[PDB]
Design a protein around this ligand. Structure first.
Ligand SMILES: [Zn+2]
Ligand SMILES: [Zn+2]
Length: 65
């Protein structure tokens, strides 16, 4: 539930033991705390390759079972 730790707000899953990361079109990674600060401040910019997200798009998950 931690791994390398979120990219934008690198802190959640590593500190927070109850979240998940959502991937986007290009297929990268957006922790739960990212989709919150990534869009509230712009929305449409991958947390890493800044790909021009046609419009948000973040599939979160973690359980896997
Ligand atoms: Zn984050
Ligand atoms: Zn990307």
């Amino acid at each position: 539930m931690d791994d390398q730790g979120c990219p934008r707000c690198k802190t959640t899953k590593y500190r927070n033991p109850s979240l998940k990361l959502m991937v986007n079109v290009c297929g990268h990674t957006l922790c739960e705390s990212c989709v919150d600060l990534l869009f509230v401040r712009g929305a449409g910019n991958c947390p890493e390759c800044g790909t021009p997200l046609r419009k948000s798009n973040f599939r979160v998950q973690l359980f896997e079972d």
